[PDB]
mmCIF file of C-alpha atoms and ligand atoms in Angstrom:
data_model
loop_
_atom_site.group_PDB
_atom_site.id
_atom_site.type_symbol
_atom_site.label_atom_id
_atom_site.label_comp_id
_atom_site.label_asym_id
_atom_site.label_seq_id
_atom_site.Cartn_x
_atom_site.Cartn_y
_atom_site.Cartn_z
ATOM 1 C CA UNK A 1 120.229 114.059 99.916
ATOM 2 C CA UNK A 2 116.827 112.579 101.054
ATOM 3 C CA UNK A 3 116.171 112.125 104.863
ATOM 4 C CA UNK A 4 113.111 112.321 106.869
ATOM 5 C CA UNK A 5 112.532 113.966 110.258
ATOM 6 C CA UNK A 6 110.303 112.839 113.407
ATOM 7 C CA UNK A 7 109.424 115.514 116.063
ATOM 8 C CA UNK A 8 107.923 114.535 119.316
ATOM 9 C CA UNK A 9 105.651 117.236 120.999
ATOM 10 C CA UNK A 10 105.746 117.216 124.948
ATOM 11 C CA UNK A 11 104.614 119.339 127.789
ATOM 12 C CA UNK A 12 105.497 119.456 131.474
ATOM 13 C CA UNK A 13 102.622 119.113 133.748
ATOM 14 C CA UNK A 14 102.686 119.457 137.504
ATOM 15 C CA UNK A 15 102.740 115.604 138.071
ATOM 16 C CA UNK A 16 104.363 114.215 134.893
ATOM 17 C CA UNK A 17 105.236 114.784 131.304
ATOM 18 C CA UNK A 18 102.674 114.177 128.617
ATOM 19 C CA UNK A 19 103.412 113.491 124.839
ATOM 20 C CA UNK A 20 101.446 114.840 121.938
ATOM 21 C CA UNK A 21 100.431 111.848 119.647
ATOM 22 C CA UNK A 22 98.784 112.310 116.313
ATOM 23 C CA UNK A 23 96.095 110.026 114.689
ATOM 24 C CA UNK A 24 95.874 109.667 110.995
ATOM 25 C CA UNK A 25 92.514 109.923 109.171
ATOM 26 C CA UNK A 26 93.330 107.414 106.447
ATOM 27 C CA UNK A 27 94.456 104.492 108.803
ATOM 28 C CA UNK A 28 94.297 103.579 112.562
ATOM 29 C CA UNK A 29 97.650 104.896 113.357
ATOM 30 C CA UNK A 30 99.040 107.038 116.107
ATOM 31 C CA UNK A 31 102.340 108.745 115.286
ATOM 32 C CA UNK A 32 104.364 111.883 115.815
ATOM 33 C CA UNK A 33 105.211 114.863 113.642
ATOM 34 C CA UNK A 34 106.936 113.648 110.395
ATOM 35 C CA UNK A 35 108.148 114.806 107.035
ATOM 36 C CA UNK A 36 110.897 114.971 104.319
ATOM 37 C CA UNK A 37 113.677 117.327 103.814
ATOM 38 C CA UNK A 38 112.970 119.949 101.059
ATOM 39 C CA UNK A 39 115.249 121.835 98.712
ATOM 40 C CA UNK A 40 118.495 122.799 100.451
ATOM 41 C CA UNK A 41 117.002 122.516 104.079
ATOM 42 C CA UNK A 42 119.335 121.392 106.973
ATOM 43 C CA UNK A 43 118.010 118.652 108.914
ATOM 44 C CA UNK A 44 116.967 120.799 111.913
ATOM 45 C CA UNK A 45 115.381 123.311 109.513
ATOM 46 C CA UNK A 46 113.162 120.568 108.192
ATOM 47 C CA UNK A 47 112.094 119.555 111.595
ATOM 48 C CA UNK A 48 111.215 123.116 112.594
ATOM 49 C CA UNK A 49 109.188 123.764 109.550
ATOM 50 C CA UNK A 50 107.204 120.659 109.709
ATOM 51 C CA UNK A 51 106.492 121.377 113.464
ATOM 52 C CA UNK A 52 105.208 124.896 112.791
ATOM 53 C CA UNK A 53 103.087 123.658 109.850
ATOM 54 C CA UNK A 54 101.644 120.476 111.324
ATOM 55 C CA UNK A 55 100.617 122.166 114.560
ATOM 56 C CA UNK A 56 100.204 125.898 113.780
ATOM 57 C CA UNK A 57 102.866 126.980 116.180
ATOM 58 C CA UNK A 58 104.680 130.214 116.963
ATOM 59 C CA UNK A 59 107.909 130.652 115.271
ATOM 60 C CA UNK A 60 110.021 130.752 118.771
ATOM 61 C CA UNK A 61 109.200 127.061 119.614
ATOM 62 C CA UNK A 62 111.928 125.165 121.696
ATOM 63 C CA UNK A 63 113.311 122.360 119.914
ATOM 64 C CA UNK A 64 115.835 119.635 120.965
ATOM 65 C CA UNK A 65 117.706 116.975 119.127
ATOM 66 C CA UNK A 66 117.511 113.208 119.974
ATOM 67 C CA UNK A 67 120.321 110.496 119.472
ATOM 68 C CA UNK A 68 117.532 108.071 118.085
ATOM 69 C CA UNK A 69 117.411 107.480 114.381
ATOM 70 C CA UNK A 70 116.371 104.782 112.091
ATOM 71 C CA UNK A 71 115.937 103.933 108.460
ATOM 72 C CA UNK A 72 112.804 103.836 106.475
ATOM 73 C CA UNK A 73 112.356 101.851 103.222
ATOM 74 C CA UNK A 74 112.694 104.795 100.530
ATOM 75 C CA UNK A 75 109.752 103.397 98.402
ATOM 76 C CA UNK A 76 107.459 105.061 100.955
ATOM 77 C CA UNK A 77 108.652 108.434 99.420
ATOM 78 C CA UNK A 78 110.900 108.231 96.313
ATOM 79 C CA UNK A 79 111.009 105.893 93.145
ATOM 80 C CA UNK A 80 114.798 106.262 93.421
ATOM 81 C CA UNK A 81 117.747 105.086 95.360
ATOM 82 C CA UNK A 82 118.880 105.216 98.102
ATOM 83 C CA UNK A 83 117.083 101.863 99.289
ATOM 84 C CA UNK A 84 116.418 103.378 102.669
ATOM 85 C CA UNK A 85 116.569 106.843 104.179
ATOM 86 C CA UNK A 86 117.389 108.118 107.529
ATOM 87 C CA UNK A 87 114.873 109.425 109.982
ATOM 88 C CA UNK A 88 116.310 112.009 112.448
ATOM 89 C CA UNK A 89 114.375 112.727 115.706
ATOM 90 C CA UNK A 90 113.719 115.816 117.825
ATOM 91 C CA UNK A 91 111.445 117.033 120.474
ATOM 92 C CA UNK A 92 109.506 120.217 120.887
ATOM 93 C CA UNK A 93 108.334 121.743 124.125
ATOM 94 C CA UNK A 94 104.804 123.005 123.842
ATOM 95 C CA UNK A 95 104.339 123.704 127.475
ATOM 96 C CA UNK A 96 102.053 126.967 127.648
ATOM 97 C CA UNK A 97 102.062 127.299 123.832
ATOM 98 C CA UNK A 98 99.083 127.494 121.485
ATOM 99 C CA UNK A 99 98.740 124.957 118.806
ATOM 100 C CA UNK A 100 96.040 123.062 116.803
ATOM 101 C CA UNK A 101 96.594 120.100 114.381
ATOM 102 C CA UNK A 102 96.500 120.920 110.651
ATOM 103 C CA UNK A 103 93.563 118.839 109.523
ATOM 104 C CA UNK A 104 94.810 116.248 106.908
ATOM 105 C CA UNK A 105 94.864 112.683 105.996
ATOM 106 C CA UNK A 106 98.167 112.507 107.983
ATOM 107 C CA UNK A 107 96.493 113.646 111.180
ATOM 108 C CA UNK A 108 93.015 114.987 112.318
ATOM 109 C CA UNK A 109 93.647 115.000 116.106
ATOM 110 C CA UNK A 110 96.346 115.320 118.679
ATOM 111 C CA UNK A 111 96.145 113.743 122.131
ATOM 112 C CA UNK A 112 98.351 114.504 125.223
ATOM 113 C CA UNK A 113 99.092 111.351 126.886
ATOM 114 C CA UNK A 114 101.467 109.682 129.467
ATOM 115 C CA UNK A 115 104.635 107.831 128.452
ATOM 116 C CA UNK A 116 103.001 104.563 129.169
ATOM 117 C CA UNK A 117 99.910 105.372 127.025
ATOM 118 C CA UNK A 118 101.872 106.576 124.130
ATOM 119 C CA UNK A 119 103.787 103.384 123.985
ATOM 120 C CA UNK A 120 100.635 101.456 123.773
ATOM 121 C CA UNK A 121 99.225 103.806 121.058
ATOM 122 C CA UNK A 122 102.158 104.266 118.718
ATOM 123 C CA UNK A 123 102.126 102.388 115.570
ATOM 124 C CA UNK A 124 106.071 102.283 114.703
ATOM 125 C CA UNK A 125 109.035 101.121 116.670
ATOM 126 C CA UNK A 126 111.085 104.094 115.735
ATOM 127 C CA UNK A 127 108.685 106.478 117.331
ATOM 128 C CA UNK A 128 108.655 104.318 120.622
ATOM 129 C CA UNK A 129 112.574 104.231 120.796
ATOM 130 C CA UNK A 130 112.714 108.050 120.229
ATOM 131 C CA UNK A 131 109.997 108.515 122.892
ATOM 132 C CA UNK A 132 111.864 106.222 125.213
ATOM 133 C CA UNK A 133 115.080 108.337 124.934
ATOM 134 C CA UNK A 134 113.046 111.674 125.292
ATOM 135 C CA UNK A 135 111.244 110.362 128.336
ATOM 136 C CA UNK A 136 114.603 109.208 130.002
ATOM 137 C CA UNK A 137 116.154 112.696 129.154
ATOM 138 C CA UNK A 138 113.109 114.415 130.714
ATOM 139 C CA UNK A 139 113.147 112.459 133.991
ATOM 140 C CA UNK A 140 116.882 113.090 134.190
ATOM 141 C CA UNK A 141 116.781 116.737 133.159
ATOM 142 C CA UNK A 142 119.356 115.481 130.479
ATOM 143 C CA UNK A 143 118.134 117.122 127.280
ATOM 144 C CA UNK A 144 120.779 117.552 124.461
ATOM 145 C CA UNK A 145 121.867 121.254 124.288
ATOM 146 C CA UNK A 146 119.834 123.409 121.904
ATOM 147 C CA UNK B 1 132.623 102.955 126.003
ATOM 148 C CA UNK B 2 130.626 103.286 122.807
ATOM 149 C CA UNK B 3 128.232 100.188 122.913
ATOM 150 C CA UNK B 4 126.492 98.955 119.749
ATOM 151 C CA UNK B 5 124.757 96.036 118.440
ATOM 152 C CA UNK B 6 124.907 94.027 115.231
ATOM 153 C CA UNK B 7 122.185 92.395 112.990
ATOM 154 C CA UNK B 8 123.262 89.578 110.569
ATOM 155 C CA UNK B 9 120.770 88.248 107.942
ATOM 156 C CA UNK B 10 121.735 84.772 106.544
ATOM 157 C CA UNK B 11 120.684 84.291 102.932
ATOM 158 C CA UNK B 12 121.027 81.447 100.152
ATOM 159 C CA UNK B 13 120.632 81.648 96.383
ATOM 160 C CA UNK B 14 118.347 78.917 95.120
ATOM 161 C CA UNK B 15 117.517 77.855 91.562
ATOM 162 C CA UNK B 16 114.334 79.859 91.611
ATOM 163 C CA UNK B 17 114.725 82.821 94.296
ATOM 164 C CA UNK B 18 116.643 83.990 97.237
ATOM 165 C CA UNK B 19 115.796 82.494 100.616
ATOM 166 C CA UNK B 20 116.390 83.987 104.056
ATOM 167 C CA UNK B 21 117.438 82.420 107.183
ATOM 168 C CA UNK B 22 115.339 83.130 110.416
ATOM 169 C CA UNK B 23 115.972 81.641 113.873
ATOM 170 C CA UNK B 24 113.351 80.501 116.232
ATOM 171 C CA UNK B 25 114.333 80.891 120.015
ATOM 172 C CA UNK B 26 114.599 78.012 122.322
ATOM 173 C CA UNK B 27 113.052 79.827 125.304
ATOM 174 C CA UNK B 28 110.370 82.014 123.644
ATOM 175 C CA UNK B 29 107.998 81.797 120.482
ATOM 176 C CA UNK B 30 110.150 84.535 118.754
ATOM 177 C CA UNK B 31 111.788 84.469 115.218
ATOM 178 C CA UNK B 32 115.017 86.702 114.834
ATOM 179 C CA UNK B 33 118.107 87.157 113.018
ATOM 180 C CA UNK B 34 121.744 86.805 114.085
ATOM 181 C CA UNK B 35 122.386 89.562 116.931
ATOM 182 C CA UNK B 36 124.904 90.542 119.407
ATOM 183 C CA UNK B 37 126.698 93.204 121.057
ATOM 184 C CA UNK B 38 130.195 94.721 120.405
ATOM 185 C CA UNK B 39 132.751 93.504 122.953
ATOM 186 C CA UNK B 40 136.314 94.862 124.004
ATOM 187 C CA UNK B 41 137.886 96.872 121.165
ATOM 188 C CA UNK B 42 136.068 95.275 118.170
ATOM 189 C CA UNK B 43 135.496 96.853 114.931
ATOM 190 C CA UNK B 44 131.758 96.487 114.057
ATOM 191 C CA UNK B 45 132.595 94.158 111.148
ATOM 192 C CA UNK B 46 134.334 91.981 113.708
ATOM 193 C CA UNK B 47 131.454 91.641 115.991
ATOM 194 C CA UNK B 48 129.336 90.720 113.116
ATOM 195 C CA UNK B 49 131.755 88.032 112.205
ATOM 196 C CA UNK B 50 132.098 86.840 115.713
ATOM 197 C CA UNK B 51 128.259 86.660 116.213
ATOM 198 C CA UNK B 52 127.693 84.904 113.032
ATOM 199 C CA UNK B 53 130.305 82.236 113.890
ATOM 200 C CA UNK B 54 129.015 81.757 117.493
ATOM 201 C CA UNK B 55 125.328 81.489 116.356
ATOM 202 C CA UNK B 56 125.663 79.237 113.158
ATOM 203 C CA UNK B 57 129.030 77.353 114.222
ATOM 204 C CA UNK B 58 130.666 78.134 111.040
ATOM 205 C CA UNK B 59 134.284 77.576 109.789
ATOM 206 C CA UNK B 60 136.459 80.641 109.388
ATOM 207 C CA UNK B 61 135.884 82.250 105.983
ATOM 208 C CA UNK B 62 132.400 83.310 104.819
ATOM 209 C CA UNK B 63 131.331 86.385 102.529
ATOM 210 C CA UNK B 64 129.671 89.102 104.692
ATOM 211 C CA UNK B 65 128.067 92.077 103.372
ATOM 212 C CA UNK B 66 127.067 95.539 104.558
ATOM 213 C CA UNK B 67 123.739 97.159 104.847
ATOM 214 C CA UNK B 68 122.808 100.761 105.109
ATOM 215 C CA UNK B 69 119.829 100.000 107.393
ATOM 216 C CA UNK B 70 120.443 101.335 110.831
ATOM 217 C CA UNK B 71 118.172 101.704 113.994
ATOM 218 C CA UNK B 72 118.634 102.749 117.662
ATOM 219 C CA UNK B 73 117.660 100.502 120.506
ATOM 220 C CA UNK B 74 116.742 101.274 124.103
ATOM 221 C CA UNK B 75 120.072 100.442 125.562
ATOM 222 C CA UNK B 76 118.211 98.857 128.637
ATOM 223 C CA UNK B 77 117.748 95.755 126.446
ATOM 224 C CA UNK B 78 121.518 95.211 126.615
ATOM 225 C CA UNK B 79 123.099 97.491 129.235
ATOM 226 C CA UNK B 80 122.399 99.105 132.664
ATOM 227 C CA UNK B 81 124.161 102.312 131.718
ATOM 228 C CA UNK B 82 124.169 105.187 129.363
ATOM 229 C CA UNK B 83 123.760 105.766 126.553
ATOM 230 C CA UNK B 84 119.957 105.861 126.562
ATOM 231 C CA UNK B 85 119.894 104.240 123.127
ATOM 232 C CA UNK B 86 122.667 102.363 121.009
ATOM 233 C CA UNK B 87 122.925 101.767 117.342
ATOM 234 C CA UNK B 88 122.149 98.556 115.638
ATOM 235 C CA UNK B 89 124.224 97.953 112.364
ATOM 236 C CA UNK B 90 123.001 95.417 109.926
ATOM 237 C CA UNK B 91 124.886 92.896 107.634
ATOM 238 C CA UNK B 92 124.108 89.819 105.586
ATOM 239 C CA UNK B 93 125.963 86.448 105.038
ATOM 240 C CA UNK B 94 125.754 84.200 102.133
ATOM 241 C CA UNK B 95 125.550 80.765 103.040
ATOM 242 C CA UNK B 96 124.705 79.335 99.554
ATOM 243 C CA UNK B 97 127.761 77.184 99.583
ATOM 244 C CA UNK B 98 127.805 76.128 103.343
ATOM 245 C CA UNK B 99 124.228 75.911 104.520
ATOM 246 C CA UNK B 100 124.795 72.062 105.048
ATOM 247 C CA UNK B 101 127.480 72.993 107.676
ATOM 248 C CA UNK B 102 125.401 75.281 109.771
ATOM 249 C CA UNK B 103 124.548 74.021 113.335
ATOM 250 C CA UNK B 104 122.846 76.158 115.966
ATOM 251 C CA UNK B 105 123.744 76.962 119.546
ATOM 252 C CA UNK B 106 121.363 76.215 122.329
ATOM 253 C CA UNK B 107 119.739 79.634 122.025
ATOM 254 C CA UNK B 108 117.724 78.501 119.080
ATOM 255 C CA UNK B 109 115.545 75.662 118.018
ATOM 256 C CA UNK B 110 115.476 76.033 114.362
ATOM 257 C CA UNK B 111 116.856 77.719 111.375
ATOM 258 C CA UNK B 112 114.173 78.194 108.715
ATOM 259 C CA UNK B 113 115.001 79.128 105.043
ATOM 260 C CA UNK B 114 111.951 81.093 103.851
ATOM 261 C CA UNK B 115 110.921 83.569 101.100
ATOM 262 C CA UNK B 116 111.119 87.310 101.616
ATOM 263 C CA UNK B 117 107.425 87.480 102.194
ATOM 264 C CA UNK B 118 107.538 84.591 104.714
ATOM 265 C CA UNK B 119 110.418 86.130 106.457
ATOM 266 C CA UNK B 120 108.462 89.455 106.964
ATOM 267 C CA UNK B 121 105.474 87.724 108.419
ATOM 268 C CA UNK B 122 107.687 85.813 110.904
ATOM 269 C CA UNK B 123 109.570 89.058 112.085
ATOM 270 C CA UNK B 124 108.556 91.469 114.962
ATOM 271 C CA UNK B 125 110.771 94.761 114.712
ATOM 272 C CA UNK B 126 110.303 97.358 112.162
ATOM 273 C CA UNK B 127 114.186 97.528 112.151
ATOM 274 C CA UNK B 128 114.590 93.935 110.990
ATOM 275 C CA UNK B 129 112.066 94.297 108.441
ATOM 276 C CA UNK B 130 113.587 97.266 106.935
ATOM 277 C CA UNK B 131 117.073 95.704 106.834
ATOM 278 C CA UNK B 132 115.411 92.565 105.131
ATOM 279 C CA UNK B 133 113.758 94.893 102.474
ATOM 280 C CA UNK B 134 117.060 96.620 101.739
ATOM 281 C CA UNK B 135 118.797 93.229 101.317
ATOM 282 C CA UNK B 136 116.115 91.882 99.132
ATOM 283 C CA UNK B 137 116.253 94.813 96.852
ATOM 284 C CA UNK B 138 120.149 94.633 96.660
ATOM 285 C CA UNK B 139 120.006 90.920 95.786
ATOM 286 C CA UNK B 140 117.424 91.411 93.054
ATOM 287 C CA UNK B 141 119.506 94.169 91.671
ATOM 288 C CA UNK B 142 123.038 92.424 92.180
ATOM 289 C CA UNK B 143 123.876 95.671 94.139
ATOM 290 C CA UNK B 144 125.792 94.379 97.249
ATOM 291 C CA UNK B 145 128.738 95.784 99.092
ATOM 292 C CA UNK B 146 131.068 93.385 101.012
ATOM 293 C CA UNK B 147 131.810 94.055 104.809
HETATM 294 CA CA1 CA C 201 104.258 116.059 107.427
HETATM 295 CA CA1 CA C 202 124.324 86.482 119.864
#
């Protein structure tokens, strides 16, 4: 095995970068794309899938790894050990791409926001750290190779 | 390099339950665990030991335990240089037999021994709450792993 993935949507604008934060319907929570590994999926396979599903994307979406990862208490997901499961992070570039959020309790809207505004909106520390890393990498044209 | 951080959660076994040791900062209204960064050529376990000794002014030999909970931290909290984020590894220390010997450094104003639920209320960072959850489940289950 169990693991989770987190996927941050971003776009390049003329002035800055913006980031795609999602708002849940069942709680006042801003988060990113998230979900669990299924069947025999590799980690990056899980991230691509959840991205394509949650946002209704085209299959050739550009996706990048991030170093940031964190543990999640496993009871959020499983009755069983392990006690905690890892959350692996990625980012997806939706510059000039069609999308629309899949309406669900996990998210009813998406909003494109500045780094600073996403930091104020985001519920979870793991999301904020992952975003920090992404923003730094974008600014420095220093993404991990994909 | 490869900088990293450690987190160390003190705990004690009482007649009733387990209690957890949280530290209040001298210079801010902030409650935290033992924390510090790797120095020189330290193994991560050696950093955890050192930081625990520095912060709790302990003699040489105490039982440390490893936790699976891990988190990345914006390295800017700690360093001026890459990497962008560094890992934080977590641990726990049993002070059931030596809690009377504990004295704090000037960085802290109080060590408070509190229940699980009370500790969660004091804490700020998801990463610390997550480590504490794991510790608490492991104690309850008698399922610990020594550092
Ligand atoms: Ca999902
Ligand atoms: Ca320290």
